[PDB]
Amino acid sequence: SNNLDSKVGGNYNYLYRLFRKSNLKPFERDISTEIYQAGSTPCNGVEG
Amino acid sequence: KNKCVNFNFNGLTGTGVLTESNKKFLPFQQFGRDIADTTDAVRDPQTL
Amino acid sequence: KNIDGYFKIYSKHTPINLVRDLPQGFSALEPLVDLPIGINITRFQTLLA
């Protein structure tokens, strides 16, 4: 859909999850906007 | 009815003879299966 | 119950003559409707008149 969805300058409306604390089960929609950690290091709010 | 014909009721494929039996289908029961878990009786979707 | 997002609802209405806790008997419940909501349910409440 390059001629339909994309636009000049970049269409940044579509999002995706880079990682989670663990792998999710199949057929499961998750719309949570919480910051998830990659490892065991507790972050508690801010990014890093 | 009373003829060996191929049936197909919403994917319920098979071959048999159609007739009216004493099966008392409940309002929610769509179609019945025999001891072999094979469709032995169905309900007409168009007119009940 | 909520199986694969398909919320099942069963119902059964029958008369009784009860003067104590839940009757000690048996009665098969039939399905009323199926609501494919597609969400995870963890809590519930009920309404009273």
Curated annotation (Swiss-Prot), chain A:
Assembly, per entry: Binds to host ACE2. RBD also interacts with the N-linked glycan on 'Asn-90' of ACE2. Cleavage of S generates a polybasic C-terminal sequence on S1 that binds to host Neuropilin-1 (NRP1) and Neuropilin-2 (NRP2) receptors. Interacts with host integrin alpha-5/beta-1 (ITGA5:ITGB1) and with ACE2 in complex with integrin alpha-5/beta-1 (ITGA5:ITGB1). May interact via cytoplasmic c-terminus with M protein. May interact (via N-terminus) with host bilirubin and biliverdin, thereby preventing antibody binding to the SARS-CoV-2 spike NTD via an allosteric mechanism.
Region (Immunodominant HLA epitope recognized by the CD8+): 11-19
Effect annotated for changing residue 15 to Q: In strain: Omicron/BA.2.12.1
Outcome of substituting residue 46 to A: Increased resistance to neutralizing antibodies
Organism encoding this protein: Severe acute respiratory syndrome coronavirus 2 (2019-nCoV)
Full protein name: Spike protein S1
Effect of residue 19 to L: In strain: Omicron/EG.5.1
Stretches for region Disordered: 18-48
Effect of residue 16 to F: Decreased HLA binding to NF9 epitope. Increased binding affinity to human ACE2
Function: Attaches the virion to the cell membrane by interacting with host receptor, initiating the infection. The major receptor is host ACE2. When S2/S2' has been cleaved, binding to the receptor triggers direct fusion at the cell membrane. When S2/S2' has not been cleaved, binding to the receptor results in internalization of the virus by endocytosis using host TFRC and GRM2 and leading to fusion of the virion membrane with the host endosomal membrane. Alternatively, may use NRP1/NRP2 and integrin as entry receptors.
Region (Receptor-binding motif): 1-48
Outcome after substituting residue 40 to N: In strain: 20A.EU2, Iota/B.1.526, Omicron/BA.1, Omicron/BA.2, Omicron/BA.2.12.1, Omicron/BA.2.75, Omicron/BA.4, Omicron/BA.5, Omicron/BQ.1.1, Omicron/XBB.1.5, Omicron/EG.5.1
Effect of residue 15 to R: In strain: Delta/B.1.617.2, Epsilon/B.1.427/B.1.429, Kappa/B.1.617.1, Lambda/C.37, 19B/501Y, Omicron/BA.4, Omicron/BA.5, Omicron/BQ.1.1; Contributes to cellular immunity evasion and increases infectivity
Shown residues within the full chain: 438 to 485 of 1273
